mmCIF file of C-alpha atoms in Angstrom:
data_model
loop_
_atom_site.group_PDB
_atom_site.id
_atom_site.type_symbol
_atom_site.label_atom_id
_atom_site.label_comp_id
_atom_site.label_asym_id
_atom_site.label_seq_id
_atom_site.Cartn_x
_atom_site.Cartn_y
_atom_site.Cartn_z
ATOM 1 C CA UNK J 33 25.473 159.799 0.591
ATOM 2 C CA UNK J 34 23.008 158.303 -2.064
ATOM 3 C CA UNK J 35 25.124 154.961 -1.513
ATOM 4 C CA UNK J 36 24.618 154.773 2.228
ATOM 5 C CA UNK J 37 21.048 154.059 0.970
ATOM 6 C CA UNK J 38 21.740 151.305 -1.088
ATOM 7 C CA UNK J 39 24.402 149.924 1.003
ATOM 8 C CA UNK J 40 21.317 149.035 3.182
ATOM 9 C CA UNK J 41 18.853 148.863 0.328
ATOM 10 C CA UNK J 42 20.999 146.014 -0.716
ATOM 11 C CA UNK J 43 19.705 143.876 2.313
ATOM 12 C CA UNK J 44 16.667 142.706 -0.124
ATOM 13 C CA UNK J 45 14.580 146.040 -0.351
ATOM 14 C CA UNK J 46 13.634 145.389 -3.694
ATOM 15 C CA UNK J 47 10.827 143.934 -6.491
ATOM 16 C CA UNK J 48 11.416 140.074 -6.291
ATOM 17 C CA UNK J 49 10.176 139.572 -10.262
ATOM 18 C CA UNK J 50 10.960 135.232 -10.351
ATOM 19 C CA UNK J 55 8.752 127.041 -5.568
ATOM 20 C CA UNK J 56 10.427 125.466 -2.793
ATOM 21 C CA UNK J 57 7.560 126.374 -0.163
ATOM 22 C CA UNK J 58 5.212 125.065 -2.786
ATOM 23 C CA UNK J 59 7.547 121.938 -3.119
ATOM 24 C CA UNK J 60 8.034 121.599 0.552
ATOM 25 C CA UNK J 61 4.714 121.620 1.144
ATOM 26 C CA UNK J 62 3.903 119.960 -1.735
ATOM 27 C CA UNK J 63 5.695 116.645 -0.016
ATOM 28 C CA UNK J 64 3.877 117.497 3.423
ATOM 29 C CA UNK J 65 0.970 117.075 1.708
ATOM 30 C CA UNK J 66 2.149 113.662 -0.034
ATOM 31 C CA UNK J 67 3.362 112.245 3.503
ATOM 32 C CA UNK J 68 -0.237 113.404 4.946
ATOM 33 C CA UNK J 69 -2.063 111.624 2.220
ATOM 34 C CA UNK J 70 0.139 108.017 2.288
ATOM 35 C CA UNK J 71 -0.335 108.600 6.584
ATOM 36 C CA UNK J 72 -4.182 109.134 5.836
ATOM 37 C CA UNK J 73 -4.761 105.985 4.155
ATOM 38 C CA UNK J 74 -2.547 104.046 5.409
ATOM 39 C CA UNK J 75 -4.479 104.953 8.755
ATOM 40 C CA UNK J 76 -8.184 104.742 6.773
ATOM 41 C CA UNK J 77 -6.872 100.897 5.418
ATOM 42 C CA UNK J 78 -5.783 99.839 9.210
ATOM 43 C CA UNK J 79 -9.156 100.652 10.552
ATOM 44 C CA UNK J 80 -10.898 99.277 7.572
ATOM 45 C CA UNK J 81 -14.385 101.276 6.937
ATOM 46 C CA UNK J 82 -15.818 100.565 9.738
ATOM 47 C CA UNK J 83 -17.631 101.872 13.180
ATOM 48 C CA UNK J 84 -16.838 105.558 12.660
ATOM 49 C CA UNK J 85 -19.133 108.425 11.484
ATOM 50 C CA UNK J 86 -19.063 108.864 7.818
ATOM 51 C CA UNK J 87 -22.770 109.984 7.610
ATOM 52 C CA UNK J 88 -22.012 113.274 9.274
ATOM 53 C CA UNK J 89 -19.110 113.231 7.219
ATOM 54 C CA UNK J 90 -20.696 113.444 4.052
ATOM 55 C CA UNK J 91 -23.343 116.103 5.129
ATOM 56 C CA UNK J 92 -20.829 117.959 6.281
ATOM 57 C CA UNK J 93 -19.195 118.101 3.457
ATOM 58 C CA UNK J 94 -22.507 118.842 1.649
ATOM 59 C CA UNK J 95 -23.311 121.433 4.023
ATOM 60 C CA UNK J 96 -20.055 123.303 3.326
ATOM 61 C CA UNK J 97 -20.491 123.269 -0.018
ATOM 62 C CA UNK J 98 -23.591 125.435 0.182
ATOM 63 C CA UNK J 99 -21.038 127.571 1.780
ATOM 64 C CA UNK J 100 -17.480 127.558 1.244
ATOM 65 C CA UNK A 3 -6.841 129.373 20.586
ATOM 66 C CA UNK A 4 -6.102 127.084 16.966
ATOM 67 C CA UNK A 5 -3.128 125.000 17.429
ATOM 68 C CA UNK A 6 -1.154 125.301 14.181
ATOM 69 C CA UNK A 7 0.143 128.841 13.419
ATOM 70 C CA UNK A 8 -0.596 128.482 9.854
ATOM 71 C CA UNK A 9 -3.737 127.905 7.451
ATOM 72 C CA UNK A 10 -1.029 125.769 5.572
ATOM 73 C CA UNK A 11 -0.049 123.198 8.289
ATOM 74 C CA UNK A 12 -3.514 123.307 9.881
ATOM 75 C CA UNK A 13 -4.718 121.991 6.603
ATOM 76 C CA UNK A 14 -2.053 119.193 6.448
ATOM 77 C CA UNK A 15 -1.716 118.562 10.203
ATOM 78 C CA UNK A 16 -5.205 118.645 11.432
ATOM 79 C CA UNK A 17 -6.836 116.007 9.830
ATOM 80 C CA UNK A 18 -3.807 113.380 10.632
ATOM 81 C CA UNK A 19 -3.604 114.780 14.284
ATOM 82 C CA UNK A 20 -7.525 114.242 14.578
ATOM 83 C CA UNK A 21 -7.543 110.874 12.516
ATOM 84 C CA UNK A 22 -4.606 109.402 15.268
ATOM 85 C CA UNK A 23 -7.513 110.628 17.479
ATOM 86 C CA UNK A 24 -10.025 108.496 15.902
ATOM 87 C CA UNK A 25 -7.843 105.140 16.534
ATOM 88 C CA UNK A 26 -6.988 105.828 20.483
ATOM 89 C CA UNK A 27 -10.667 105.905 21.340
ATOM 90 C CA UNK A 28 -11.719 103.046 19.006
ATOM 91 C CA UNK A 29 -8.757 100.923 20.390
ATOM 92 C CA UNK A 30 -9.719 102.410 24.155
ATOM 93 C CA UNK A 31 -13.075 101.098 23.096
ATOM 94 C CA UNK A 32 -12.188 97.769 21.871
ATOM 95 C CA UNK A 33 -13.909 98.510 18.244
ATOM 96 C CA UNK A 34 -10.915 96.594 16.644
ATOM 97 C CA UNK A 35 -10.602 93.506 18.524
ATOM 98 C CA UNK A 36 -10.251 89.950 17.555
ATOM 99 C CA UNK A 37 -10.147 91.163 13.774
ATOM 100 C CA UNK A 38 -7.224 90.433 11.051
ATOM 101 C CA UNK A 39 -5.600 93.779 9.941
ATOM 102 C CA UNK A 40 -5.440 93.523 5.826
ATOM 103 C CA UNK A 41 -1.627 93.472 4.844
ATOM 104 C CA UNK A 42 -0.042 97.399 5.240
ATOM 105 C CA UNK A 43 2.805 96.711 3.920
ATOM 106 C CA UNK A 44 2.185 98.208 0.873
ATOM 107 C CA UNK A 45 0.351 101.685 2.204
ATOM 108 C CA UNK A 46 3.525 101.709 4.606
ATOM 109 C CA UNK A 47 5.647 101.520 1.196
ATOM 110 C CA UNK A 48 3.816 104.518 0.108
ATOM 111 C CA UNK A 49 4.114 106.291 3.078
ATOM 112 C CA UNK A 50 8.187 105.322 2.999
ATOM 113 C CA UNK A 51 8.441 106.480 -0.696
ATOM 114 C CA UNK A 52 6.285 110.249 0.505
ATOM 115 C CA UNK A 53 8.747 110.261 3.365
ATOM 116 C CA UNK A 54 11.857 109.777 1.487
ATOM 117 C CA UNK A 55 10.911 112.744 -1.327
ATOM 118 C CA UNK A 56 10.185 115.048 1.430
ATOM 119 C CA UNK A 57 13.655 114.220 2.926
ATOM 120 C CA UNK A 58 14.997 114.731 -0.253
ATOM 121 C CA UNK A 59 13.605 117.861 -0.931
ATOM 122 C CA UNK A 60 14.512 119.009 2.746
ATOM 123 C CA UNK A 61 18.058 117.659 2.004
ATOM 124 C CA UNK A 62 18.114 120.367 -0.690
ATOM 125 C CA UNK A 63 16.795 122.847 0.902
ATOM 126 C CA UNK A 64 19.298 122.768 3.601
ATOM 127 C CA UNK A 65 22.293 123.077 1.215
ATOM 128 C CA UNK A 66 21.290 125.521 -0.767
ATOM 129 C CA UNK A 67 19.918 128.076 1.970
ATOM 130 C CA UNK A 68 21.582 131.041 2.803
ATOM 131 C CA UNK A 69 19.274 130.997 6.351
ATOM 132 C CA UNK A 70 22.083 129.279 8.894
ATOM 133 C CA UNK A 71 19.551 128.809 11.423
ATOM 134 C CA UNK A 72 17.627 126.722 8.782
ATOM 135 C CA UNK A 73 20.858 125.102 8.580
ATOM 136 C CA UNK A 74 20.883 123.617 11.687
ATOM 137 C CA UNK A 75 17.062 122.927 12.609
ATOM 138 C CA UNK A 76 15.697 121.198 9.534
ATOM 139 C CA UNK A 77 18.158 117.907 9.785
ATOM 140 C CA UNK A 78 16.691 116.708 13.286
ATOM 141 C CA UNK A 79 13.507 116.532 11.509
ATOM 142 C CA UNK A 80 14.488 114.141 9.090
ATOM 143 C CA UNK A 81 15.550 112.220 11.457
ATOM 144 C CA UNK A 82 12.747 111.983 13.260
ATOM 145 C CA UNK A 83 10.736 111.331 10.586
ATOM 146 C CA UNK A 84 12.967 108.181 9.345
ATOM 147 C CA UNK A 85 12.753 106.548 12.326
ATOM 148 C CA UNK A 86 8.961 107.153 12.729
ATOM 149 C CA UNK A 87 9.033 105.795 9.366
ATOM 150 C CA UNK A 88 10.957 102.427 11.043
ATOM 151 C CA UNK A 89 8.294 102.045 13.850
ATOM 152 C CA UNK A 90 5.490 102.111 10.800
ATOM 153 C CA UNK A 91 7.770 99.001 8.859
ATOM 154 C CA UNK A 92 7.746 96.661 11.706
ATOM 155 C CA UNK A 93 4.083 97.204 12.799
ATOM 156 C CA UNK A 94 3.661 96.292 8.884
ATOM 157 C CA UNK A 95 5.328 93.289 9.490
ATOM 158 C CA UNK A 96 4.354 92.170 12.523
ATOM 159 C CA UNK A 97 0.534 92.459 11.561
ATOM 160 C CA UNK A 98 1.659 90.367 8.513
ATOM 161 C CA UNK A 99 3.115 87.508 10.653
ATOM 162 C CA UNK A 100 0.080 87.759 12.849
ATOM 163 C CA UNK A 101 -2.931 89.724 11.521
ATOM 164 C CA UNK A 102 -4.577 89.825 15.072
ATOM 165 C CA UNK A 103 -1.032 91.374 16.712
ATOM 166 C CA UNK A 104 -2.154 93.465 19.542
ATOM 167 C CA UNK A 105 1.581 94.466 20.822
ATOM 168 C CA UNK A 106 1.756 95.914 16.728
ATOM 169 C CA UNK A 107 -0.663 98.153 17.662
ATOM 170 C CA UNK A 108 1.910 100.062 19.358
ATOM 171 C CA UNK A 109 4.148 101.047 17.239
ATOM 172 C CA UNK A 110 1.691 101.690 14.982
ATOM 173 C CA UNK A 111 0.633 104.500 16.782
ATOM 174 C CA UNK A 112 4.101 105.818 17.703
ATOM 175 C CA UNK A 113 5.168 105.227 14.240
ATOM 176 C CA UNK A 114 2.012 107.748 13.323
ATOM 177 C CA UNK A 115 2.642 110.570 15.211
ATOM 178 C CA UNK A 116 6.368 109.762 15.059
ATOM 179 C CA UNK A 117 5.567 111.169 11.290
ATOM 180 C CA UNK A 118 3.414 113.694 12.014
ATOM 181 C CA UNK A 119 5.519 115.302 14.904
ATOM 182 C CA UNK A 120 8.314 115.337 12.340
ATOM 183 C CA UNK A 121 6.638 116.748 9.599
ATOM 184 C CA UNK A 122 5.205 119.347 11.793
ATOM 185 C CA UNK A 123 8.873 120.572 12.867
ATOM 186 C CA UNK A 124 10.220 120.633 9.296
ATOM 187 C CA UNK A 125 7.504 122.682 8.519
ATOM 188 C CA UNK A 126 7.498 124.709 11.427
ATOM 189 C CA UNK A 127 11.112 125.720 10.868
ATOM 190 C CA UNK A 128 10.539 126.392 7.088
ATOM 191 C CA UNK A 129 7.838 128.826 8.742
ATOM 192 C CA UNK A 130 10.151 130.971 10.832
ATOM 193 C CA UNK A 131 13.337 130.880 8.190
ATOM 194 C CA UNK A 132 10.045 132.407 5.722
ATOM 195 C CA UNK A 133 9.602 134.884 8.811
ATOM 196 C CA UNK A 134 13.436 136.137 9.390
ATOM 197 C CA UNK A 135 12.733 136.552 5.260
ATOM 198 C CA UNK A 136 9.901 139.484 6.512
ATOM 199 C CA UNK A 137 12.038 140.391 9.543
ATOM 200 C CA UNK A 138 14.985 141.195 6.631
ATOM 201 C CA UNK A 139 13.013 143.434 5.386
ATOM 202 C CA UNK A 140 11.619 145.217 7.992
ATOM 203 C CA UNK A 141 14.984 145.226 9.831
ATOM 204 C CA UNK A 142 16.134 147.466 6.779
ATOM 205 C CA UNK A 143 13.162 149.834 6.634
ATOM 206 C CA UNK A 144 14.322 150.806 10.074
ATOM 207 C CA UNK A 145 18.105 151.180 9.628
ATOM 208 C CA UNK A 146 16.593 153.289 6.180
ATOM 209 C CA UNK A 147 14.880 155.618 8.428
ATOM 210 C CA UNK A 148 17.945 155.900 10.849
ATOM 211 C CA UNK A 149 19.149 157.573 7.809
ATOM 212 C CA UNK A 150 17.133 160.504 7.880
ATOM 213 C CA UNK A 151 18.444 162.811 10.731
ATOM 214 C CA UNK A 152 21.245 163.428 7.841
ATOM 215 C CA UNK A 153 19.340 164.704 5.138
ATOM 216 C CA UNK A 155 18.753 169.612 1.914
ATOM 217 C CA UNK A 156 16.229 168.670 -0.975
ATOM 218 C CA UNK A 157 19.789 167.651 -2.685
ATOM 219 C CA UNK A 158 20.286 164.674 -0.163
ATOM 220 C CA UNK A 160 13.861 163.837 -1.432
ATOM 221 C CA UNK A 161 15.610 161.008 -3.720
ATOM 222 C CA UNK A 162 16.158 159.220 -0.515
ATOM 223 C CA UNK A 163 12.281 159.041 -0.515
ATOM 224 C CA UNK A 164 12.319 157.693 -3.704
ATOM 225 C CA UNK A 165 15.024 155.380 -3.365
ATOM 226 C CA UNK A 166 12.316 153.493 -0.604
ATOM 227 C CA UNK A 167 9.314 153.237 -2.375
ATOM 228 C CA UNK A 168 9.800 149.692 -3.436
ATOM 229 C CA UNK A 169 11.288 148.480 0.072
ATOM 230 C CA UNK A 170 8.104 150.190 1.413
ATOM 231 C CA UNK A 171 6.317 147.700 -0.574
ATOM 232 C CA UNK A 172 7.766 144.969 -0.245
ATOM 233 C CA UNK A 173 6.903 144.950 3.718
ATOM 234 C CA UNK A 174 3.410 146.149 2.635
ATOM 235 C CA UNK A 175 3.183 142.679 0.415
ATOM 236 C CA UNK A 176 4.639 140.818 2.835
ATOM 237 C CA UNK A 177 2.844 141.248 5.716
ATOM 238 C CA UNK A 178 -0.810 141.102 4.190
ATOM 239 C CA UNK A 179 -0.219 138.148 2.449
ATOM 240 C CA UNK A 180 1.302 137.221 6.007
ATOM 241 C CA UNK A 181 -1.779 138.190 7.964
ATOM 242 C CA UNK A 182 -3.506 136.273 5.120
ATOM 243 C CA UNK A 183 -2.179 133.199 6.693
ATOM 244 C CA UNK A 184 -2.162 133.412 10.555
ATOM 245 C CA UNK A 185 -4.575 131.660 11.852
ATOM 246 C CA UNK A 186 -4.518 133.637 15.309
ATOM 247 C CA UNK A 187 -6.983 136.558 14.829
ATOM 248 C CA UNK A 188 -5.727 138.655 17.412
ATOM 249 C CA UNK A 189 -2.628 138.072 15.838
ATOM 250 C CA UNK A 190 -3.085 139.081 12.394
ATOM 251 C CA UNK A 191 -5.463 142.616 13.796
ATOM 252 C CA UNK A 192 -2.103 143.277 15.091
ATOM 253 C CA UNK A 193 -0.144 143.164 12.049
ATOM 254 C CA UNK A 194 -2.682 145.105 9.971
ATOM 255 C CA UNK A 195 -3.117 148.045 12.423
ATOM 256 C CA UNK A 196 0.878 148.458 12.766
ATOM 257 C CA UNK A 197 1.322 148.399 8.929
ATOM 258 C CA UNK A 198 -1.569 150.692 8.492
ATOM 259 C CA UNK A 199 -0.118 152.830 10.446
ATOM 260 C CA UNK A 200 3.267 152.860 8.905
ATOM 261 C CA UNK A 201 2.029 153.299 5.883
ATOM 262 C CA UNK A 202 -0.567 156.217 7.031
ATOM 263 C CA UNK A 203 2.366 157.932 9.001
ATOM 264 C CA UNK A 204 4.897 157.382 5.709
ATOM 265 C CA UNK A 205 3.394 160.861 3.539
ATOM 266 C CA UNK A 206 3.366 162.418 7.176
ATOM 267 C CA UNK A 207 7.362 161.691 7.640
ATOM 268 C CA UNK A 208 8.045 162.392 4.037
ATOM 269 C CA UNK A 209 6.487 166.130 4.505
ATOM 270 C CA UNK A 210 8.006 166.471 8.079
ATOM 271 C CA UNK A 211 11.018 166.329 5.825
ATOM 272 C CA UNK A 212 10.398 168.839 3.539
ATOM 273 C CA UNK A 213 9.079 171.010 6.735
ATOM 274 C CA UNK A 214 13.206 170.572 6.679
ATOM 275 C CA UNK A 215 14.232 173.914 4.916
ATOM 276 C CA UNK A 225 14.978 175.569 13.792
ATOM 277 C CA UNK A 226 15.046 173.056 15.945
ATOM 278 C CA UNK A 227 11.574 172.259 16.134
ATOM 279 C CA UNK A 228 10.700 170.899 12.651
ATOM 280 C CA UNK A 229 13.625 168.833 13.741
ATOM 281 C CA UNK A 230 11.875 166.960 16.652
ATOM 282 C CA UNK A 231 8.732 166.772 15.017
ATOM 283 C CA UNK A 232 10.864 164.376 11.958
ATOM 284 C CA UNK A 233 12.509 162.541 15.008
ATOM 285 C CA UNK A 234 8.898 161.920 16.742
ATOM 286 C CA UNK A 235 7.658 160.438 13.649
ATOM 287 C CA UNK A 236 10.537 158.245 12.583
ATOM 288 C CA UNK A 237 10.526 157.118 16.430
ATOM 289 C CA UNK A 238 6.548 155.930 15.997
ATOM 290 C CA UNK A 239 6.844 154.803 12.669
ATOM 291 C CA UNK A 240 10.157 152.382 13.999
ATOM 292 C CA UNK A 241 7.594 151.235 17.441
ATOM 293 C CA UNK A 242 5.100 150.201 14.624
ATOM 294 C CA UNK A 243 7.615 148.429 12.941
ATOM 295 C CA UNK A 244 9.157 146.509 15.740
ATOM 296 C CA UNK A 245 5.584 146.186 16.838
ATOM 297 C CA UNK A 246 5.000 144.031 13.513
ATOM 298 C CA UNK A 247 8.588 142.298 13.462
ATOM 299 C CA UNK A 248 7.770 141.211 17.487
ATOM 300 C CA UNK A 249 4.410 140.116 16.467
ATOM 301 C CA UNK A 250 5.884 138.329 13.580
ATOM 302 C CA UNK A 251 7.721 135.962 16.084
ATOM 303 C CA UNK A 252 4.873 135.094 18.421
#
């Protein structure tokens, strides 16, 4: 009766009290960062808009 | 629509998906030519070092999981992402034999979204093993209200033994909703659980209105709408 209830409560119906998706992601993050330079060093800082970049950045920032 | 499901991967993915972009159309346009490439071998060291901890990490996950279907998805995209890795070495070294290598350019590029396709997949499968977590949940909260065409007072506790599931789902699907980065989406998810939850004092009283047989069908009609709201979110969930 009152264990038919638990028998199903048991399939994680619970509190959780207490970092792999933080880890995981943590290491997405490090991948996307060596990719980023790695891809900012191969062009070399030049002929693409970094003006706009800034501003935009700027802009946000009276925002975000 | 957005491309990546999630606020999370869109803020990884985006940028190196629109930086790749960057390259095609300076190459296309010939911004690059006749210049010496500064030696990579060391960024493409970093990048082999990230690559190899997220492997690792991946590697763990995989063996200690309890999700099978995790099991078997996350390995490919390893693999893909150590040979991506490959492509990346030798367009290292062939810009380091010749600094003005225009055939390196190549795998430079495939190397690039070699990574970034990878990464993408790993995460995308972490994603939907974090979703069958939600689905778990709400999977129960349905077979718990199955339960309730067999229930005198003696037989209410019931409604107090599901409180906590109850919020669980609640938890899980706003900070869900939190993170979908398809609007329609996540209006979808908040109007079903609002409704559960709205309906929930409704079903618990329909229950009490248990002390005929209509009281009976008017319990049955709102476990029936509360379970379409439910598989409404777990459906929706999936998308």
């Amino acid at each position: 009766e009152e264990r038919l209830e638990s028998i199903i409560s048991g399939a994680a119906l619970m509190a959780d009290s207490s970092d792999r998706r933080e880890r995981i992601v943590a290491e997405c993050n490090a991948v996307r960062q060596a990719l980023q330079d790695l891809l900012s060093e191969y062009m070399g800082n030049a002929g693409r808009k970094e003006r706009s970049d800034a501003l935009n950045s700027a802009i946000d920032k009276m925002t975000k | 629509m957005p491309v990546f499901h999630t606020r999370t991967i869109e803020s990884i993915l985006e940028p190196v998906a629109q930086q790749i972009s960057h390259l095609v159309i300076m190459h296309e346009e010939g911004e690059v030519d006749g210049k010496a490439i500064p030696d990579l071998t060391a960024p493409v060291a970093a990048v082999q070092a990230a690559v190899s901890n997220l492997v690792r990490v991946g590697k763990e996950t995989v063996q200690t999981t309890e999700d099978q279907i995790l099991k078997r998805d996350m390995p490919p995209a390893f693999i893909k992402v150590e040979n991506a890795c490959t492509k990346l070495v030798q367009a290292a070294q062939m810009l380091q034999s010749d600094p003005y290598s225009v055939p390196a350019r190549d795998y430079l590029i495939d190397g690039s979204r070699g990574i970034l396709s990878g990464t993408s997949d790993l995460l995308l499968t972490f994603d939907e093993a974090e979703v069958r977590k939600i689905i778990r949940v709400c999977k129960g909260i349905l077979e718990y209200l199955t339960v309730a065409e067999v229930v005198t007072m003696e037989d209410v506790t019931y409604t107090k033994n599901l409180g906590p599931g109850m919020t669980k789902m609640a938890k899980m699907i706003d900070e869900r909703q939190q993170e979908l980065t398809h609007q329609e989406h996540r209006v979808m998810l908040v109007n079903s659980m609002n409704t559960v939850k709205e309906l929930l004092p409704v079903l618990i009283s329909a229950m009490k209105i248990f002390v005929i047989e209509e009281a009976l069908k008017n319990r049955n009609f709102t476990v029936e709408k509360m379970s379409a709201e439910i598989n409404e979110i777990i459906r929706v969930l999936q998308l």
